[PDB]
C-alpha cells in the first residue's frame, strides 16, 4: 500500500479523491509492479493520460 501511494504521489501528486477513480483504482496495482525499475516517471504520466482518455469516450 505504501508503494501504491508513493507511486500515486510520484505520478502527479494526485489527491486520494482521484485515487478512488476507477481508472486509477484498476491501474495503480499494475503501476505497483513497476517503477521499482529505472523505467521513468514521465512514462507513467503519459500512460495515465492516454488511459484516462480511452476511458472517456462518450
Amino acid at each position: 500500500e505504501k508503494k501504491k501511494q508513493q507511486m500515486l504521489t510520484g505520478v502527479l501528486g494526485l489527491q486520494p479523491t482521484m485515487a478512488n477513480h476507477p481508472v486509477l483504482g484498476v491501474f495503480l496495482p499494475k503501476y505497483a509492479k513497476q517503477n521499482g525499475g529505472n523505467v521513468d516517471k514521465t512514462a507513467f504520466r503519459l500512460d495515465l493520460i492516454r488511459m484516462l482518455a480511452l476511458h472517456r469516450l462518450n
Binding site: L12, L14, Q15, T17, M18, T42, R45, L48, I49
Partner: protein
C-alpha cells in the same frame, strides 16, 4: 506507406510544398516533454 504512398509523400515534400513555398518554409520539432507537462497541468482535476 507502400510504394504508391511513399512516392506521393515524396511528391508533395519535394515538388508541391517547395515550389509553392519558394524556400520560405521552416521545419523542426516542438519539445517532447513540456507537452506532457501541459497535459499534466490539465489532468489533476477529475470532477465530471
Amino acid at each position: 506507406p507502400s510504394n504508391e504512398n511513399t512516392i506521393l509523400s515524396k511528391i508533395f515534400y519535394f515538388c508541391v510544398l517547395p515550389a509553392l513555398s519558394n524556400n520560405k518554409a521552416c521545419g523542426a520539432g516542438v519539445n517532447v516533454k513540456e507537452l506532457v507537462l501541459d497535459l499534466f497541468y490539465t489532468e489533476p482535476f477529475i470532477c465530471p
